[PDB]
């Protein structure tokens, strides 16, 4: 006298299944991104200004060596 055994859902019910779109925001603000970009640009401009002025002085020294040697 065996009872009916059959593939059925468990008692009560199966756990809820997610189906809605899940796309998080995941970012900074536009103002912050622009501000970081301009800050990086200004730091680069200042560094390049110093280095190019030093390069100009070094080139002047190199040219003076040639002027001394030319005669």
């Amino acid at each position: 006298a065996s009872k009916v055994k059959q593939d059925m859902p468990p008692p009560g019910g199966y756990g809820p299944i997610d189906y809605k779109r899940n796309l998080p925001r995941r970012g900074l603000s536009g103002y912050s991104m622009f501000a970081v970009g301009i800050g990086t640009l200004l730091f680069g401009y200042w560094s390049m200004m110093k280095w190019n002025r030093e390069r100009r002085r070094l080139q002047i020294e190199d040219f003076e060596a040639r002027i001394a040697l030319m005669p």
Partner: protein
Amino acid sequence: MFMINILSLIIPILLAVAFLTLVERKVLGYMQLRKGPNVVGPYGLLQPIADALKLFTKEPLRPATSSISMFIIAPILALSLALTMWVPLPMPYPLINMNLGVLFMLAMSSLAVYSILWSGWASNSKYALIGALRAVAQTISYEVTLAIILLSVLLMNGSYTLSTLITTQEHIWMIFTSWPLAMMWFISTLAETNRAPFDLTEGESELVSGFNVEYAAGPFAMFFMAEYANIIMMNAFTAILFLGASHDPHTPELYTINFVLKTLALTITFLWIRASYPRFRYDQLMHLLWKSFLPLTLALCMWHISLPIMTASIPPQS
């Protein structure tokens, strides 16, 4: 002894291209939740060799309706120009030292398009013609912007000599000075190398094989080698231009290692981009380059002309 140097530049480049192909397949596979070549050799290290040996022992086909002289000349021109673009690159010393190395790369990259043009036309088939005409449109789209971007960036260098770029970036990478130019330069290199999302000439889903559809065996292998050598070469040029490694004249190998690492990072970024985006439409590429990149590039060119005079930052050289 200069011949030994030529060979020591040519052979390693071809080996790197052969393994670049293996790397692309493995990176794309792992990005697509699979493995990629891992049977032919340990970790697929012998797969490029099998591919090359297979392609150079298969039957090369000459189409009946094709023009033979251009059909055969075009892959030769492609591969020879791809190998020639490497000679002025300082790593940290160039094989050929040029006053105007940047102009030399510009001119040879301009000449490299004619390989695709002549290949597509001389195949005398409709898909090859459509691919060649897409190459025409692509060059028209990117060339002016790329030249003006290069000029704007090199206004900080003082010359067109590629080795001077090492001295210019002794303290800071030039990407911190001109990142808006670096973004457009990177996208223009993607367009110039016919890479996804800008790979219109091959047009695989759309045009089956594009310009080289009628190419088989060795000639097709030469086109493939030229394209991948161009990928590596353009990324090395970008690495020298925007991420300048520090050079010790008594230990140049440190510069060499740093430069190679940066070039690999940029090439892997190319492969990363290919696995992420859909293909552009070629008129949309033209409109992107002419309506967005061109006005910004013109404005930034004026800014980079005025800024050194504004702040007394003009570089040394004549």
